[PDB]
Design a protein around this nucleic acid. Sequence first.
DNA 1: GAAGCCACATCCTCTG
DNA 2: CAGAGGATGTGGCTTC
Lengths: 121, 98, 117
Amino acid sequence: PRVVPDQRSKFENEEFFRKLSRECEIKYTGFRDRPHEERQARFQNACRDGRSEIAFVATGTNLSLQFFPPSREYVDLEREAGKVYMILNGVCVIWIDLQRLDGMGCLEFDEERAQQEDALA
Amino acid sequence: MPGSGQIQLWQFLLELLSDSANASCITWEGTNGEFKMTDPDEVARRWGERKSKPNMNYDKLSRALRYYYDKNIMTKVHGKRYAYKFDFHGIAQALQPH
Amino acid sequence: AELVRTDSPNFLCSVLPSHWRCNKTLPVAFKVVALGEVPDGTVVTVMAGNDENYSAELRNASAVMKNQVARFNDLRFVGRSGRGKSFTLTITVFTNPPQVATYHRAIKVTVDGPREP
DNA sequence: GAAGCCACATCCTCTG
DNA sequence: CAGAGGATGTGGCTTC
């Protein structure tokens, strides 16, 4: 089973999820042993490719992301200058400074896919 | 830094370079950072005398020195029988920040 | 080899021991199991998660799913967790869409593996 | 003071 | 055989 039966419940009951429901402190974890300049380019070119590695500093939780099903509503570099805007533990769920390679982010329960996925059973 | 309190190699080794009376066993080789190795196994012996490590030889002390490469303390003069040199332009990034 | 639970009950992985040395040949290599049928060829990477140094350095961190069992030639933990502190290492499966199982209290990464003090 | 560091120790290996 | 190097125990020394 790709997902848990009570998909909505686990998100609204697990300390793990609710601890990441609020806007938390995140940062780019890619190529840590590389100069700030190289890390800046790698992270931007990759975002344009629709992928990256971002982790919630506070909690310690890392993630490899894929902004797809090039996109628009998944990777927008226009909503603000100098920055840019999956199934986690059987739960369908859904900005970084282009200079500091850090920022804020959070998780959001995916009602849509939760249904589509749950329907595949 | 903990080079102060507890004894090092590079901190120790250079008690013998600067001191005229220990040239029996080593010497500065030139204007630029370089150093010769006179008795390769009397060297190691005294580093045992200090470290309280009587088993010590060149092979042992030497390995320790070859670590320094990746950390940019010192480097090898290629092909020369027992001669390396100190990187100071890096000892001060290794003893202070930026 | 022996297995342990996950935070996604669709996947399981090795019993990575309590406390080990920074960058060692692991005492038991890393197996990662696919219960859900996965195309044998899909990639799996891990990322060491901890409130302190939130992305640690790892080696042979990427592996290939084969016979529904992704194995890591030899994973090695370089970036230390700290005193009393372990890794909640993340586990990615490269698919459309990819999926992850968090894994709290995985392993304590210090410079000495636990010598008789 | 065990729990993390540290900077060699001691080791056996290649490979020029 | 020297010389770079992985692996793994060792002992002194700061830090919780």
